[PDB]
Amino acid sequence: GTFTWTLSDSEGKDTPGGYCLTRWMLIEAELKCFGNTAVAKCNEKHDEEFCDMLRLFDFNKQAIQRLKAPAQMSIQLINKAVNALINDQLIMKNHLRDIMCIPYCNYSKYWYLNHTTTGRTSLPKCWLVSNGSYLNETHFSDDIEQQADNMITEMLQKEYMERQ
Amino acid sequence: SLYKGVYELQTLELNMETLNMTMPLSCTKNNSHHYIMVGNETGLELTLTNTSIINHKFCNLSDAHKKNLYDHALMSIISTFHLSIPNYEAMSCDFNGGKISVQYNLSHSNHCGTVANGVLQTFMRMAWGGSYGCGNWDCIMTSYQYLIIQNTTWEDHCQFSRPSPIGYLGLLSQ
Amino acid sequence: GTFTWTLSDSEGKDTPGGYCLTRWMLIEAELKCFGNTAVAKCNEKHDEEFCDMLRLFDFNKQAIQRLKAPAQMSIQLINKAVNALINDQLIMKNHLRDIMCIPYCNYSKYWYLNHTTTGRTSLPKCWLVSNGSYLNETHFSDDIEQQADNMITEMLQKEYMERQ
Amino acid sequence: SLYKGVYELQTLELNMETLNMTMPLSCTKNNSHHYIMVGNETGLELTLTNTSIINHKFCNLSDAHKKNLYDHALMSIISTFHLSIPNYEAMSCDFNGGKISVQYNLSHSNHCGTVANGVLQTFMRMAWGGSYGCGNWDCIMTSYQYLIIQNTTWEDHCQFSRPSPIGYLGLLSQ
Amino acid sequence: GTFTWTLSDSEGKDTPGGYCLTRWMLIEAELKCFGNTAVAKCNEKHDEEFCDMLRLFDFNKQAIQRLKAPAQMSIQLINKAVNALINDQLIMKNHLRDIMCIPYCNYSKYWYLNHTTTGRTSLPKCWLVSNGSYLNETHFSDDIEQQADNMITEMLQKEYMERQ
Amino acid sequence: SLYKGVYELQTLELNMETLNMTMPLSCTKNNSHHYIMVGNETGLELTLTNTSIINHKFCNLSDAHKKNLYDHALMSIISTFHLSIPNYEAMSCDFNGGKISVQYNLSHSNHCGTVANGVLQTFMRMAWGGSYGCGNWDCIMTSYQYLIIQNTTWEDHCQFSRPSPIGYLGLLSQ
Ligand SMILES: *[C@@H]1O[C@H](CO)[C@@H](O[C@@H]2O[C@H](CO)[C@@H](O[C@@H]3O[C@H](CO[C@H]4O[C@H](CO)[C@@H](O)[C@H](O)[C@@H]4O)[C@@H](O)[C@H](O[C@H]4O[C@H](CO)[C@@H](O)[C@H](O)[C@@H]4O)[C@@H]3O)[C@H](O)[C@H]2NC(C)=O)[C@H](O)[C@H]1NC(C)=O
Ligand SMILES: *[C@@H]1O[C@H](CO)[C@@H](O[C@@H]2O[C@H](CO)[C@@H](O[C@@H]3O[C@H](CO[C@H]4O[C@H](CO)[C@@H](O)[C@H](O)[C@@H]4O)[C@@H](O)[C@H](O[C@H]4O[C@H](CO)[C@@H](O)[C@H](O)[C@@H]4O)[C@@H]3O)[C@H](O)[C@H]2NC(C)=O)[C@H](O)[C@H]1NC(C)=O
Ligand SMILES: *[C@@H]1O[C@H](CO)[C@@H](O[C@@H]2O[C@H](CO)[C@@H](O[C@@H]3O[C@H](CO[C@H]4O[C@H](CO)[C@@H](O)[C@H](O)[C@@H]4O)[C@@H](O)[C@H](O[C@H]4O[C@H](CO)[C@@H](O)[C@H](O)[C@@H]4O)[C@@H]3O)[C@H](O)[C@H]2NC(C)=O)[C@H](O)[C@H]1NC(C)=O
Ligand SMILES: *[C@@H]1O[C@H](CO)[C@@H](O[C@@H]2O[C@H](CO)[C@@H](O[C@@H]3O[C@H](CO)[C@@H](O)[C@H](O)[C@@H]3O)[C@H](O)[C@H]2NC(C)=O)[C@H](O)[C@H]1NC(C)=O
Ligand SMILES: *[C@@H]1O[C@H](CO)[C@@H](O[C@@H]2O[C@H](CO)[C@@H](O[C@@H]3O[C@H](CO)[C@@H](O)[C@H](O)[C@@H]3O)[C@H](O)[C@H]2NC(C)=O)[C@H](O)[C@H]1NC(C)=O
Ligand SMILES: *[C@@H]1O[C@H](CO)[C@@H](O[C@@H]2O[C@H](CO)[C@@H](O[C@@H]3O[C@H](CO)[C@@H](O)[C@H](O)[C@@H]3O)[C@H](O)[C@H]2NC(C)=O)[C@H](O)[C@H]1NC(C)=O
Ligand SMILES: *[C@@H]1O[C@H](CO)[C@@H](O[C@@H]2O[C@H](CO)[C@@H](O)[C@H](O)[C@H]2NC(C)=O)[C@H](O)[C@H]1NC(C)=O
Ligand SMILES: *[C@@H]1O[C@H](CO)[C@@H](O[C@@H]2O[C@H](CO)[C@@H](O)[C@H](O)[C@H]2NC(C)=O)[C@H](O)[C@H]1NC(C)=O
Ligand SMILES: *[C@@H]1O[C@H](CO)[C@@H](O[C@@H]2O[C@H](CO)[C@@H](O)[C@H](O)[C@H]2NC(C)=O)[C@H](O)[C@H]1NC(C)=O
Ligand SMILES: *[C@@H]1O[C@H](CO)[C@@H](O[C@@H]2O[C@H](CO)[C@@H](O)[C@H](O)[C@H]2NC(C)=O)[C@H](O)[C@H]1NC(C)=O
Ligand SMILES: *[C@@H]1O[C@H](CO)[C@@H](O[C@@H]2O[C@H](CO)[C@@H](O)[C@H](O)[C@H]2NC(C)=O)[C@H](O)[C@H]1NC(C)=O
Ligand SMILES: *[C@@H]1O[C@H](CO)[C@@H](O[C@@H]2O[C@H](CO)[C@@H](O)[C@H](O)[C@H]2NC(C)=O)[C@H](O)[C@H]1NC(C)=O
Ligand SMILES: *[C@@H]1O[C@H](CO)[C@@H](O[C@@H]2O[C@H](CO)[C@@H](O)[C@H](O)[C@H]2NC(C)=O)[C@H](O)[C@H]1NC(C)=O
Ligand SMILES: *[C@@H]1O[C@H](CO)[C@@H](O[C@@H]2O[C@H](CO)[C@@H](O)[C@H](O)[C@H]2NC(C)=O)[C@H](O)[C@H]1NC(C)=O
Ligand SMILES: *[C@@H]1O[C@H](CO)[C@@H](O[C@@H]2O[C@H](CO)[C@@H](O)[C@H](O)[C@H]2NC(C)=O)[C@H](O)[C@H]1NC(C)=O
Ligand SMILES: *[C@@H]1O[C@H](CO)[C@@H](O[C@@H]2O[C@H](CO)[C@@H](O)[C@H](O)[C@H]2NC(C)=O)[C@H](O)[C@H]1NC(C)=O
Ligand SMILES: *[C@@H]1O[C@H](CO)[C@@H](O[C@@H]2O[C@H](CO)[C@@H](O)[C@H](O)[C@H]2NC(C)=O)[C@H](O)[C@H]1NC(C)=O
Ligand SMILES: *[C@@H]1O[C@H](CO)[C@@H](O[C@@H]2O[C@H](CO)[C@@H](O)[C@H](O)[C@H]2NC(C)=O)[C@H](O)[C@H]1NC(C)=O
């Protein structure tokens, strides 16, 4: 019950921890699961494209399972629900970046770091595009490394405080 | 590729098609065709042409619901597009039978400020695709004279893009 | 002056610390005060029903004390102020949960943990309802315990860093 | 009840009645009656009936402010309710004298898409109470033919609920 | 690349770290630069007037440099972009405070602490006004000191964890 | 001044004039004059007077764009102000030639609820300045009979204030 970003309050207790995306939810991929700590970051972050997409999937799951009603789109339901589920500022910033020919997120692919042998995952970040294609890791090599360092720092700080 | 010795860079790609049951998805084929899809059965094509389908100089939109309408979802989507456009009545509409369609007259005299642009801008906003000469978007124009909105069937319409709820949702946010 | 969630900047300096709710503000209860640390969490949290209610009371107090004007409702004032004071997303999520028959907050009662002999309080969370009644602590026992552990962790981390 | 040995679970309940001086509070009595209250003196009842109060086929709403209106707060609340409803003129209004009242005709031919539902949905939204068969809320209907909005006095109207600012505020947010 | 509050993703790599405001951006002042750590706070803070102003300047810079188009105001661009760049709640709270004759931020001057010999800076906070003039540091002496203590605490906590 | 021994209190002041190329700035001179400026060339004065400029009892606003309009930016700003005001047609407009101007008739019979107040309130909101008797802002009135909006040139208009984008942006947020 460490996830507040979700609509219902059940989701966390079912999977042992973390949050899983099944095969059907992914393109050309098998089941992937992210650590509880990283997923829980969406509870407070109010600036991440991944978290909003994650929330839409959670919503969709609930709508399908909860509404016994014929599965017609309830347009009224979406029009009502979107204000609660989506951060419109992210939508507009990516729209704005596209307008100004600045690399931006088009909500496709997400890139994350995975610490070898431990399977420790960062929360995924959006893989930016410009001029009809994706940007190379070379352009944003620096950001990739910043995330690696952020993960290292958390690991060490935890060890020190656990040791205390 | 290991960063700082131990962190592998790994990728994830989302399948947004699974969201088709609750929200419309926008997917494009090329600069002339954008497609909005509902569920696994229907949708509307948005297309740019130099020909017409409607010979009317008027839009019978309110009559489309006065008559029992053909699909609340589609009428809602069409209305949303129209409501977004700032107005001016440069629109003709048919809505006769199950085949529902609307046509906009993208006419102008300098084009800056016309509703024809309001239509073009909304059209592009509805389906970003990859949006590919970095000028201002504010007063733009295209070569096509007309915009057609028409019902269609569940086939193809996904090239240079994949279905995404973002277009529709973005307009709701506006 | 550790509270930024308030409208005026005076509120904290008056009571020794923390924030108090008088008898008149509570149902069938006497004065209750919460610790400064917990109250201050509302400065950054943007997802808590309790904090928005707390803010409305603070607003109300200021409107009554500040406006010398006949106490008519200024509808225009509320219509103007609400956008700043209330997180509409919380309102809509609880509305949505009700629609989908998912337990939700109806802004009534709030449940908190109190560490014995020290009086250390968590910030209160909303007590959910469904099908005309309140949910038992059994259904959300897990969340209650998560909060207890969160409080324990903070206590220990503080002791260790204070010791350093 | 001590969690982890030392944490007592303790409860708090808010008195929202103290907010009556600055914002309207919504409180219900049953499925036929919802009450909106102002200050410590007045308010409006919202009720579902199968009888009528207004014999008009028209609403003299603008005339209600043309004439010096009877209370800006109440006119504002009434207007807000009406503005929320998507439109269609299935409303009749009196507003003659201090007793102000409005009546909606909840008429329909399949009911999905009617303004009668827009009214029913807004009505319920305005006063959640405890909202108690998990179907879609989008196209719903009730047994009552009419909705009456009328001034009233400061008595009772709180059963299965307590006064709360949430209903009103939620509509402002929309 | 530690700044996410910006529109483009380049801004951080250019200046060695931190964020600089040139002479042209300041009134009666020469170049000033703030530390990276403090600036980065705007990535998560959703309640600070300084951060929104900072963002407008960043936007302006990009619009001028990126748009090759004649520099006419694109009103449509601003009307579109503002929703993403400005926290309207701050605008409304200051508006509300002014209405109620409560000291408020009018987005003019900002006050910060600077640790001597190290040049360590807090993120600036808005200097409030009321009744046609600025408030004295005496009225908000307490807040100034709270910030000084917050900086001290961070310094010490870092030293202890670095030592671990 | 060192706090806790080591922290100097230092100040920063922002120059918002550098933002003139992308967004309008509001700057005042006194209670009778508020000025909105664009780029480094033009702007609109907002002024409170007891005289008139327009002898019309009507506003030719739509004709202002029907005719090739004189500046999209200014027409947009004027429209925005007008749209903000809740309505009532107590407005006359000229827009003839490059000199564009509008005049509002701030007429009332008790003033509470008139559009004249809607205009006064928006006017003040547009340019806070320093806003300097703590009564409610809701139903206020001034001594001036008319509001004039008129094009002007790039001179002065900054006393007791400095240019700021906040006024305009605040109205967009509303
Ligand atoms: C975010 O931004 C990125 C970057 O622009 C977009 O990425 C593009 O995604 C599209 C769709 O996945 C790629 O387009 C093409 O997809 C074809 C698959 O569909 C075909 O077959 C079905 C039937 O099964 C038909 O219905 C359909 O009409 C098509 O005929 C591929 O076959 C295409 O292959 C061609 O290009 C590749 C190069 O990538 C060559 O190797 C092939 O030989 C062939 O010539 C093609 O892949 C498009 O390529 C992607 N671009 C890039 C740079 O990767 C994202 O779509 C966008 N948004 C989201 C939400 O993801
Ligand atoms: C959030 O959701 C919860 C759960 O549904 C709601 O909780 C309900 O709250 C109401 C109001 O407090 C409870 O309703 C009844 O209140 C009566 C008190 O008012 C009476 O007297 C006044 C005069 O003083 C009259 O004006 C008024 O009309 C009433 O006649 C009690 O007397 C009722 O008692 C009956 O039920 C209890 C069981 O609880 C029996 O023991 C009694 O003998 C008697 O039969 C009753 O309490 C309602 O019971 C609460 N429900 C639950 C499950 O607790 C919240 O109101 C809602 N929102 C907010 C903001 O709180
Ligand atoms: C936030 O709130 C604060 C507090 O109210 C406002 O601060 C005021 O700012 C204004 C403008 O900076 C100060 O007003 C006066 O500015 C004059 C400068 O402009 C003159 O010269 C130009 C040509 O160069 C002309 O175009 C223009 O019309 C003016 O003639 C000064 O000359 C004035 O000086 C007078 O007052 C001072 C006292 O401060 C005396 O010492 C002088 O001798 C003289 O009598 C004056 O400074 C105003 O004083 C400031 N008030 C306070 C309390 O500091 C902010 O503007 C507001 N918003 C923002 C965004 O900053
Ligand atoms: C629209 O989205 C739905 C998902 O929301 C897509 O349908 C899903 O298709 C997969 C693969 O066929 C089904 O997976 C398997 O289904 C069986 C039977 O239910 C189950 O026993 C397996 O364990 C597994 O889950 C999935 O259930 C099904 N979901 C639903 C709700 O039907 C649908 O194909 C999408 N439509 C379009 C046009 O893309
Ligand atoms: C609407 O809300 C107001 C509160 O905002 C309620 O009035 C309050 O009632 C309490 C109890 O009677 C008063 O408490 C005591 O008042 C005396 C005299 O002021 C004071 O000396 C005591 O120390 C104590 O505060 C409280 O002051 C009063 N507040 C106000 C502003 O009048 C009112 O009853 C509510 N109305 C309804 C219909 O519920
Ligand atoms: C409206 O804002 C622009 C800034 O966005 C103001 O123009 C700026 O004026 C300064 C001082 O004259 C220029 O600084 C210097 O310019 C030269 C030549 O470009 C350069 O070599 C120096 O290193 C330095 O940057 C600045 O470039 C110029 N910026 C632009 C975009 O023109 C303008 O004065 C403001 N208008 C009003 C009415 O206040
Ligand atoms: C991070 O790397 C580990 C190690 O490969 C991944 O764990 C494996 O995931 C695959 C997924 O198909 C399983 O088949 C393996 O059994 C897992 N264990 C190992 C040690 O291989 C982990 O999934 C990666 N993280 C993510 C989110 O993909
Ligand atoms: C987008 O694709 C469509 C479909 O292939 C192209 O339109 C077709 O053009 C041929 C040749 O003129 C006609 O026979 C088909 O009937 C047309 N199909 C449709 C659906 O109109 C269209 O020209 C392409 N546009 C761009 C910009 O590439
Ligand atoms: C869109 O849907 C309509 C029906 O909802 C289709 O119209 C049918 O068209 C066929 C072929 O001409 C007729 O035999 C049917 O009688 C029509 N039905 C009705 C009630 O309109 C239309 O063809 C579809 N359009 C596309 C492009 O798929
Ligand atoms: C639609 O028709 C118009 C009018 O013929 C086309 O616009 C002209 O195209 C010729 C080339 O064939 C150019 O030399 C002219 O300069 C164009 N006119 C203008 C005002 O630019 C237009 O290209 C046609 N559109 C499509 C999609 O075929
Ligand atoms: C947590 O528990 C302590 C201990 O009971 C509470 O402190 C008491 O509160 C009551 C309230 O009526 C006072 O009468 C007592 O004098 C307080 N002291 C003790 C030791 O009993 C504290 O209030 C509780 N926390 C909350 C928020 O209720
Ligand atoms: C809600 O309560 C009201 C008030 O008790 C009920 O309406 C009353 O019904 C009696 C008997 O027909 C009449 O004599 C009263 O005049 C009615 N009062 C009012 C205010 O209309 C109403 O039926 C109840 N509704 C539900 C769903 O329980
Ligand atoms: C609502 O308020 C109005 C007055 O604002 C009340 O109307 C009065 O009703 C009594 C009884 O019939 C008359 O004697 C008065 O002359 C009326 N005054 C005016 C000016 O209308 C009305 O009764 C109230 N309604 C309720 C249900 O309380
Ligand atoms: C209002 O009047 C209508 C019409 O008489 C009532 O609706 C019918 O009620 C009978 C039972 O008396 C049912 O058998 C019918 O099937 C109902 N009609 C429909 C279309 O469902 C309605 O119940 C009355 N409403 C109230 C609140 O008394
Ligand atoms: C905090 O204080 C230090 C020490 O004065 C400032 O660093 C100096 O800034 C001035 C700015 O003109 C430079 O000329 C000096 O060379 C800098 N070094 C020293 C040691 O004087 C620092 O800028 C201050 N912080 C801020 C944000 O103003
Ligand atoms: C605000 O300043 C203006 C400009 O000085 C004042 O209006 C001037 O008044 C003189 C004397 O009547 C006239 O000759 C000028 O033509 C007026 N100028 C303008 C632009 O109207 C105005 O009275 C001042 N208002 C306040 C409240 O101080
Ligand atoms: C505002 O701008 C207009 C032009 O855009 C100015 O109008 C001109 O005024 C002069 C002096 O009377 C005439 O010679 C020009 O022919 C006018 N041009 C047009 C096309 O209107 C007007 O004076 C400006 N107003 C202010 C106060 O600066
Ligand atoms: C505009 O004209 C009106 C009408 O003459 C002025 O209002 C009156 O001013 C006299 C003083 O000259 C007061 O004794 C009256 O009480 C005022 N009337 C009202 C209804 O209050 C008004 O002051 C003039 N406005 C300006 C800016 O000069």
Numbering used by the authors:
A (entry chain c), C (entry chain a), E (entry chain b): 260 to 423
B (entry chain C), D (entry chain A), F (entry chain B): 60 to 146, 150 to 171, 178 to 200, 206 to 247
Sentences reproduced from the published study:
The glycoprotein complex (GPC) is expressed as a trimer on the viral surface and constitutes the sole target for NAbs. Each GPC protomer consists of two non-covalently bound subunits: the membrane-anchored GP2, which contains the fusion peptide, and GP1, which possesses receptor-binding sites for both alpha-dystroglycan and lysosome-associated membrane protein-1 (LAMP-1), the two receptors involved in viral entry and lysosomal escape, respectively. The development of a recombinant protein vaccine has been hampered by the instability of soluble Lassa virus glycoprotein complex (GPC) trimers, which disassemble into monomeric subunits after expression. Here, we use two-component protein nanoparticles consisting of trimeric and pentameric subunits to stabilize GPC in a trimeric conformation.
Due to the flexible linkage between the GPC and I53-50A, we were unable to reconstruct a single high-resolution model of the entire NP antigen (note the lack of structural features on the GPC antigens). Therefore, we separately processed the signal originating from two flexibly linked entities, the GPC trimers and I53-50NP, resulting in 3D maps at 3.97 and 3.67 Å resolution, respectively. The reconstructed GPC model features a trimer in the prefusion state. In the cryo-EM map, we observed densities corresponding to all 11 N-linked glycans for each monomer. Overall, our unliganded cryo-EM model displayed excellent structural homology with the reported antibody-complexed structure, with a Cα RMSD value of 0.92 Å suggesting that the fusion to the I53-50A component and NP assembly did not induce major conformational changes within the GPC. Closer inspection of the two models revealed local differences in two regions: the fusion peptide and the trimer apex (bottom right). In the unliganded state (cryo-EM structure; this study), fusion peptide residues G260-T274 expand into the cavity between two protomers with the N terminus (residue G260) facing outward. The unliganded structure featured a more open conformation at the apex, particularly for residues between N114 and L128. The distances between the three N119 residues from the respective protomers are ∼31 Å in the unliganded structure and ∼24 Å in the antibody-complexed structures. Finally, the local resolution of the unliganded model is lower within the central cavity of the trimer and at the apex, suggesting a higher degree of flexibility in these regions.
